[PDB]
Amino acid sequence: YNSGKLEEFVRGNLERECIEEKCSFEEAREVFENTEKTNEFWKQYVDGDQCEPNPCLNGGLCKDDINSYECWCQVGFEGKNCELDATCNIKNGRCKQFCKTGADSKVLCSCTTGYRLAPDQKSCKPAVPFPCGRVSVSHSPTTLTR
Amino acid sequence: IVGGENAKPGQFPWQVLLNGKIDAFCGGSIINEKWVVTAAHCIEPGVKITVVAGEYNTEETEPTEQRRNVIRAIPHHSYNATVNKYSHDIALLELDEPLTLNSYVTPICIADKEYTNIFLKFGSGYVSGWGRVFNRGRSATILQYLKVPLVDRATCLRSTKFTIYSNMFCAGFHEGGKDSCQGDSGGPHVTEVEGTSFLTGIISWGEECAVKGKYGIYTKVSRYVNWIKEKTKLT
User: Fold this and answer.
1) What CATH fold (topology level) applies to the domain A1-46?
2) CATH says A87-127 is which class?
3) Which residues are responsible for catalysis (chain B)?
């Protein structure tokens, strides 16, 4: 609030300043430090979270912004509001490896021998210390040929 | 490989050197720990072949090298009875003792029929192999690689007098300069799709090397990928 008696002279504690009454952004910023992280602490706090009553359906994860907002749809759903179903031809069906329609109309991903389908149902994680087709020297330990 | 560049050690974990009568006569690509792949026209009746996984510079003994002996060579059923010796120009070599899979000994990915063609028409692919660096000038001592643009049928068919079968495809620079040459057959033709690298055709033949109007012609893996699948099953 900045109204007691010499409360700037103390290290900011945003537990205190921000959602007592309500803090400024600067108050919030010197206390946060990383100001990526401030920008979004931010867009949720007030101006009517454009993510109001979740627009993205089909389990879509709505992510609000200052002005706009978008939508992360996991799997089997396309379109800015995850209304459209994912069909194997528009952007590989969202699968990182192989996708085929089946038993209905929504996609179904897969991976080549050696890899397994990640929990998102679209990515591929190894399942053998040496999966097929990967240049190993560059990767090891956790680098890239620059 | 004519007009290519030297590859970095470990950059091609599936690139295998095939030593046999006279050595370095063909290359190959590891399908998996026990079975490698190469072109049928490398299987000379009555010779003993030794796969040289993990090899790099022929003049020196790389600690990564892992030799094996072929106990069975299964060329594609309908290879060549006495007809165009580059049709189903593909074969599987069954190593006796499994290789030790590591950073330098890693298989290539075999896509299903659909995706293999899909990755082929993406435009470019890597072709690596130990062979003639000059069109009949000298062989590759240190593993060489080159990036070769898939060349459309209409153009391919015209450049060659030879009936360019469905089983194959063209790929190479329109002008004379860069291409695979003798001592590369059976090598790989891979197309990497975001890190992971897949096999899109075995490197087969070509009228001479590095001369304009000509393109290297490779085997359409898409056709036998399934054969490979069933042929290398472990369980």
Assistant:
1) Coagulation Factor IX (4.10.740)
2) mainly beta
3) 41 (charge relay system), 89 (charge relay system), 185 (charge relay system)
